[PDB]
Please model this.
Amino acid sequence: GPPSGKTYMGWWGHMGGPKQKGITSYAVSPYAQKPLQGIFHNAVFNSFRRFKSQFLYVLIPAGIYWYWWKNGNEYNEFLYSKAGREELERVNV
Amino acid sequence: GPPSGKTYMGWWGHMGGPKQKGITSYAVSPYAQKPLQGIFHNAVFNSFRRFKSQFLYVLIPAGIYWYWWKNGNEYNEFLYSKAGREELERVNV
Amino acid sequence: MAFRKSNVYLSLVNSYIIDSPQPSSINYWWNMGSLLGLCLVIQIVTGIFMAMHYSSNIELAFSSVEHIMRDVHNGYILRYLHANGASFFFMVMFMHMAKGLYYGSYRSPRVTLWNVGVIIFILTIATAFLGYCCVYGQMSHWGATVITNLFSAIPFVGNDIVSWLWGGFSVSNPTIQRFFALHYLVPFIIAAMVIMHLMALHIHGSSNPLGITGNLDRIPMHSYFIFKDLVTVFLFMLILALFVFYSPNTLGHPDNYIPGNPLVTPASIVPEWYLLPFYAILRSIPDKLLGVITMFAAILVLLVLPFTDRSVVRGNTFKVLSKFFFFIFVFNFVLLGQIGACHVEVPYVLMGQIATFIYFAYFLIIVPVISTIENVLFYIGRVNK
Amino acid sequence: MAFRKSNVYLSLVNSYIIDSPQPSSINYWWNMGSLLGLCLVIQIVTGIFMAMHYSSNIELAFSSVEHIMRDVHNGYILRYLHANGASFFFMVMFMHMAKGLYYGSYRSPRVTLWNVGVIIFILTIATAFLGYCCVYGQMSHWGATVITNLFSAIPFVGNDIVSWLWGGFSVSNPTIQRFFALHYLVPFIIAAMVIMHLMALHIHGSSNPLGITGNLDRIPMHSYFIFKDLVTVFLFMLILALFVFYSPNTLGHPDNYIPGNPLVTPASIVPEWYLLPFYAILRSIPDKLLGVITMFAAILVLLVLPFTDRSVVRGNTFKVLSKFFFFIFVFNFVLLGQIGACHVEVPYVLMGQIATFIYFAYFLIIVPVISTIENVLFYIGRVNK
Amino acid sequence: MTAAEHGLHAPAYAWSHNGPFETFDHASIRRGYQVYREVCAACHSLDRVAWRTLVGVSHTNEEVRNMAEEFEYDDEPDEQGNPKKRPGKLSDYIPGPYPNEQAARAANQGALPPDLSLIVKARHGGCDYIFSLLTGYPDEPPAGVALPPGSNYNPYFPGGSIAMARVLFDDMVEYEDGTPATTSQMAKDVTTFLNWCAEPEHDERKRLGLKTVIILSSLYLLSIWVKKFKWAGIKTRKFVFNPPKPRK
Amino acid sequence: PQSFTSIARIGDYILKSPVLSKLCVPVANQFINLAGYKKLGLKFDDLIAEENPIMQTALRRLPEDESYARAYRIIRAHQTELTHHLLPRNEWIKAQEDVPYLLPYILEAEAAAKEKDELDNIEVSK
Amino acid sequence: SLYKTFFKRNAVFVGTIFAGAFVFQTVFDTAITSWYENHNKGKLWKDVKARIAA
Ligand SMILES: CCCCCCCCCCC(=O)OC[C@H](COP(=O)(O)OC[C@H](O)COP(=O)(O)OC[C@@H](COC(=O)CC)OC(=O)CCC)OC(=O)CCCCCCCC
Ligand SMILES: CCCCCCCCCCCCCCCCCC(=O)OC[C@H](COP(=O)(O)OCCN)OC(=O)CCCCCCCCCCCCC
Ligand code: HEC
Ligand code: HEC
Ligand code: HEC
Ligand code: HEC
Ligand code: HEC
Ligand SMILES: COc1c(O)c(C)c(C/C=C(\C)CC/C=C(\C)CC/C=C(/C)CC/C=C(\C)CC/C=C(\C)CCC=C(C)C)c(O)c1OC
Ligand SMILES: COc1c(O)c(C)c(C/C=C(\C)CC/C=C(\C)CC/C=C(\C)CC/C=C(\C)CC/C=C(/C)CCC=C(C)C)c(O)c1OC
Ligand SMILES: CCCCCCCCCCCCCCC(=O)O[C@H](COC(=O)CCCCCCCCCCCC)COP(=O)(O)O
Ligand SMILES: CCCCCCCCCCCCCCC(=O)O[C@H](COC(=O)CCCCCCCCCCCC)COP(=O)(O)O
Ligand SMILES: CCCCCCCCCCCCCCCCCC(=O)O[C@H](COC(=O)CCCCCC)COP(=O)(O)OCCN
Ligand SMILES: CCCCCCCCCCCCCCCCCC(=O)O[C@H](COC(=O)CCCCCC)COP(=O)(O)OCCN
Ligand SMILES: CCCCCCCCCCCCCC(=O)O[C@H](COC(=O)CCCCCCCCCCC)COP(=O)(O)O
Model:
């Protein structure tokens, strides 16, 4: 097969990261490891941490656009009622 | 990408043939070469050579199967005629 | 070597779904790709087994769909899976493209991957529109009419292009037959574009939610991301089974069970739920030609995205203002859909125009300016002079 | 490096049709592969543009085919290209498989390539049969009936399999609709199998008409075999244009222009011209179950071919007796087709049985015995003792 | 639009077949068919409902056969090509009262009565809309509404002006089981019957939904366990780093 | 695609002015500690995307010990993001340790590529 | 080791999977049919057929 260009991911053995030295791993078999030991206290406190650091960036745009949609929908159902029909007459023309 | 198995065709440079030495090529540009100079005398004599060395291996099976088909078709149109209807009676039963 | 490495066919299966080096920090948002593959297989298999009972004449389309839902054994399962799975296909694809915008997967060296993604998105919108017109309900007929008149807006040529599309003078029997043929055809082009998408992905590997390299700590595909994708596959099938079996006709529009009548126009012509932001973008422009150009520019402005992200860090993970304006953009896209679902009434015209402007301003003004300000803020926060 | 080598997409185009090292001694018989690719593209494009006007109901199939041939602009070109190109597709495929048997391309290391070729052959026979039943003429209806009753020969299960295939109790509206859906579907499976075929080819390169290696003198694909394939492409289009425009209905059977009538049986039910050897093989066995098993074994006996060729030189080029018995086999296959075109009459039954026996004897007895004798004859011709 | 063009919002009636486990009331479907045949079937076709679908759902075998043999359908012609009729059977469809569209528009002042095979699935609101449409006619329209002559008022129709007449009055039909047949009772019965006609799969759809949701919820929890299991070697993995000797 | 010479010019114009520095350096480090890359145990020069050849050059330029430290900080960041936790407060990168260590290597590669492009497109002094 | 020989061979493992899936399909079908009929007693058609005795 033909050669190809320089990529930024190699394969197992020549992956292409920087050379690393003196960094040791430690892992235990999952047969001697108890899974889901960290669901209780975890799904409460870590989930509250993940919500607290991260909710306000979602809650302010939702608040802005929901308030703007609600004000627009309220103004719609105002001016297509009997009370605002002359205003509908002057803004539709 | 992963490595693959040993194939019998490489690529340009490491094709995988035997090492060769002292065998020189000579070729001329086709702009200074006249194409189809070898159509006349060629399509007669070389075509007759290519026919003579190679026709009989095609002509004997065609002869055998065409003679066998013709004899079978003649025997068909015999025994479904008026002359061979009693033979059709004795070979169909 | 091993047989999964030395065989010609199994080497692709190996290097794609067995020994593919994935970054070990990717969360469940890197699972929508496998989920889209599963949902495409669902769409194709239900499409074949439901198109064995479909007759594509204009006088026999709606009756054949009802023949599927009534007389065919388990045919209601097929049609409900098919329509609601197309809805989930666009929902998972929207979440996948939002994963692309958020974590900066569009940036270099993955521009080819992003462009093939945008091509897949356009082909999928085309497939969904053609298959929705194959039902030939009320909404199907009138939506086909409105979209092809939008193609008639093209100057000096457009009327003959539309008489070519219709195969006649209005939406008639040749139109529905060629929409069924094209609708059978284009998903295989989508499958070929998906294979090209996987190639352009595989030449550099996936990103990670930090925006740094992942060449240091790679874990294989097999058993790890196989069972993580199996988790989200079962969740996706659970939610699809809810919206198929317990509430099937929620996402659809009830006018689509009226047969196609060219004489009666509906009270409100609305596409199916996911094409509504694009319909709002087109309806916000007070011109037909500029409307069609703006509707296609609303997808090509995703192609102009890697050239405007001037942030020197990849992805919006560790940046404040870019993350905030990203969620401004997402809820703006939802607001485009909800503007498009409404009528052409005060003040929805003005809000549709402002919402279209904030869409294009996010893709063209907000991202480069906020990325430049965030770069300078990262620099002067830690450099003292 | 160059852009055709460094790009992800163009590297496949490069390594397949530009810089592929081909042996420089291959003649025009190594051109049927490109010719089959061109003819498959012809079949697919005419199938799409002709299936935009086709309605697959049993009461509207034949009328829609005649609507294509009469009312559609240039529709006679489409149907005549389509049917006569299917005939040329099988003729070029028969010549391609004969190139495979003659020059020994089935032998090691190309067994995977040969097996994927046999899979493509089975899928193509299936596609042609389904599309011939989509016409719903007289021959279409009764051929579908005979082939599915052959599937009813299977013990203890077969009647329910056939009621599953028919979708009813005889060849009716669901049968023709599902044959049209399957017939639209299976050519894309053929395209995927063709891509797998090209992969299994590309891992070892083509053979050559001498049966020796070709690693020494390779010339590229580009301009050389590009223009050689262009020569045979123009010859193929010339002969296809003759049999489309000047004599279109020669290869077909004239009973197929009678509409499908379940009550009237024809005087002679015959498939289209290329399935006749297989129909003769099946008709030569005086049993239904053994007939169906023998008809499928007549294709699986091509899979048992690389394990019986005991010749130590590749290909029949430099061997006398193998070349002679190869042409015995080829003219026997033609004689099978001509036996199958005839009636069940004396002596065509006995000749069909002898011809089937010579078919299986060539694939199972003649090739290993003649190859062993040819090996020993090559040895003792030049070794003196 | 105003609320008049949009039509008044039909409220949430508590049907006996709402909820993810409740099925149809088949006695109510039987009584709904009776009210259909004696009131609606003068002016509404039911073209997509075959006779065989009522066997085992709302009527027995002989009841459907003796209701279908009262009607005449087109037989294949005789040995001289003359067109002939035949009594109905189980495989035919429920015939409409009108031979074509123009007879319908002639007999109903121009307005075409829509086919009711899918009418509870082709209106927003559905069951609540059909019930409020039937039981929603005022005795007199509100003050200031000029109806076009030949049309009627009820607020649930989009626009207010409908071309239907109020056709549910007290005790115009008699029930077989002796149920008091008021207007609301008959309207509830026909709305349940039209829900059956649009959704004949409804019972089997909900029980297969129960099976599928149970099996997929169990698979989802089992797959969460197996993902937390096979990732346990990677979640708990630890890294320490003593920086190497700088002479090399 | 910011071309580090440009961001360095803007940042030095902000820092050398007293009014602009007094105005937007508190905004700057407030942005930094709301960004939260410290809490995963990273530095900002560990965070610049390195899949363009000029940054790849500036990573070849780097000394050995800082390269091994950068590799450890990346692997601990991937592991901490995998467990969906944060590093404990003793292991967070402090404000004094967030040193722009890779910035001069990046800037000299910037100046080298800029000079190569300018000299590749020169006129002649006629 | 008491159950591990019941899990050791993969043949008997997948045989246990298929036997249990067969039993699960039969029992689960019968149980969900019985519960779905019991929850809606008085509304199914065999109830109305029993009530309407004429
Ligand atoms: C039936 C519908 C099929 C539709 C498919 C359309 C394509 C038909 C393909 C037929 C074929 O491929 O046979 C190839 C066969 C072997 O070729 P070879 O390499 O051994 O000969 C080298 C040539 O002199 C080089 O000469 P050159 O390469 O310079 O030109 C070749 C020739 C092109 O002709 C063909 O391709 C085949 C007709 O140009 C001409 O001069 C033509 C003059 C009018 O050519 C021959 O030489 C004939 C030998 C007998 C074959 C009889 C076939 C009966 C089935
Ligand atoms: C189920 C499995 C499928 C089986 C398919 C059955 C066969 C399908 C029929 C297709 C026709 C293909 C014919 C055979 C194609 C290969 C023939 C060939 O390779 O041609 C070359 C051959 C010998 O040439 P060399 O390569 O040996 O030359 C070397 C020089 N020293 O040159 C020759 O010997 C002459 C070649 C002349 C070809 C004659 C073809 C006859 C076609 C049938 C005619 C029917 C009407 C009677
Ligand atoms: C035959 C192959 C086939 C394929 C492949 C296919 N569909 Fe469809 N699809 C159909 C048919 C037939 C219909 C019309 C019948 C129906 O709507 O139930 C349809 C209808 C639809 C509808 C309208 C459903 C409704 O009832 O409103 C949508 C939406 C849709 N397809 C989307 C898709 C998408 C998205 C894909 C894949 C990316 C896809 N289809 C692939 C056959 C197919
Ligand atoms: C829609 C896509 C389509 C594809 C792809 C396609 N066909 Fe067909 N084909 C048709 C249609 C439609 C018909 C029936 C109309 C006709 O016969 O003209 C047909 C008919 C046929 C017929 C019968 C022609 C006749 O009139 O007797 C044959 C033979 C056939 N196809 C073979 C093939 C083969 C071989 C291939 C590819 C390997 C193929 N088709 C691919 C659409 C297709
Ligand atoms: C236009 C955007 C876009 C569309 C549309 C799109 N993709 Fe992707 N896809 C991406 C990007 C970007 C990535 C790379 C993710 C990243 O940034 O690391 C990706 C990656 C993937 C992956 C690898 C797994 C993953 O989550 O990254 C798969 C699989 C995939 N896509 C499949 C699909 C399929 C299937 C479709 C539709 C058929 C599709 N994609 C449509 C942009 C897209
Ligand atoms: C049953 C046998 C067989 C069938 C059928 C078959 N192939 Fe081949 N094909 C081969 C073999 C064997 C080779 C290589 C022979 C050699 O090089 O000696 C081959 C080679 C090729 C080549 C390379 C050029 C050449 O002639 O060797 C192409 C291209 C190709 N096939 C395409 C196709 C296509 C397209 C089809 C139909 C869709 C097809 N093949 C059907 C066996 C087959
Ligand atoms: C007087 C003749 C007549 C009778 C009797 C009649 N209908 Fe109608 N019905 C109509 C007409 C006309 C329309 C459509 C009028 C329109 O569109 O303005 C209609 C429309 C309807 C509609 C839908 C109206 C809409 O706006 O969508 C329903 C539902 C309906 N009928 C139910 C029934 C039922 C149930 C019965 C029997 C119980 C019945 N009708 C008996 C004439 C009749
Ligand atoms: C980055 O890491 C990766 C990664 O590298 C990969 C590869 C994947 C995996 C990607 C996929 C699985 C997507 C692949 C999708 C395709 C290849 C699309 C192909 C789809 C098809 C439907 C194939 C077409 C097949 C058919 C149409 C056959 C159907 C035929 C039928 C049903 C015939 C029925 C008729 C009869 C008579 C039975 C990942 O998910 C992933 O993230 C973890
Ligand atoms: C060994 O060396 C080689 C070699 O490597 C290769 C690749 C080839 C080439 C072989 C092939 C290309 C065969 C492969 C064939 C395919 C992959 C089939 C592909 C065809 C399709 C997928 C169908 C085509 C589909 C389209 C064109 C889509 C567009 C169609 C329509 C109808 C859209 C029109 C609609 C509108 C609205 C205009 C050789 O010939 C060859 O020998 C020299
Ligand atoms: C083309 C369609 C794409 C759809 C995307 C689907 C992505 C997830 C695929 C999951 C495949 C699981 C195989 C794991 C495996 O074989 O591990 C095998 C054995 O594992 C198992 O037995 C898993 C139990 C059986 C699970 C069956 C799941 C079937 C439901 C699939 C629903 C989607 C089709 C190897 O496991 P080991 O290496 O840890 O020993
Ligand atoms: C997918 C379908 C497969 C069909 C198999 C077709 C196999 C042959 C393909 C021929 C392509 C020719 C390109 C050569 C080329 O570009 O050389 C280019 C320029 O050559 C030419 O200009 C050729 C003149 C134009 C010929 C146009 C032929 C079109 C008819 C095609 C009919 C079949 C589709 C490079 O030539 P050079 O490297 O010698 O300089
Ligand atoms: C556009 C691309 C579409 C997708 C195509 C690419 C992805 C293909 C994935 C295919 C996965 C399944 C293939 C596994 C089959 C492996 C068997 C094998 O390779 O043995 C092959 C023989 O294969 C065959 O005979 C027919 C295989 C047809 C496959 C039909 C699906 C022998 O291969 P090999 O030469 O390495 O063996 C030497 C013996 N020690
Ligand atoms: C039927 C196909 C089945 C699957 C087989 C795959 C083979 C596909 C053959 C396609 C050949 C023609 C493709 C030419 C495209 C080359 C252009 C290109 O690679 O430029 C690419 C960008 O591509 C695109 O944006 C659009 C590609 C869409 C292609 C849709 C057809 C340039 O990217 P580059 O390689 O220089 O990487 C630098 C990273 N910034
Ligand atoms: C071919 C792709 C199809 C994927 C479907 C996924 C969508 C989820 C809804 C499925 C409902 C259709 C089936 C059904 O109605 O069954 C119902 C039972 O529900 C289920 O068991 C569905 C569980 C889905 C598990 C998926 C396993 C993966 C198989 C891959 C293909 C071999 C009806 O059961 P029954 O007919 O009574 O035997």
In short: The two ends of chain D are 59 Å apart (CA to CA). The longest helix of chain D spans residues 348-382. Strands of chain D lie at 22-23, 218-219. The longest strand of chain D covers residues 22-23.
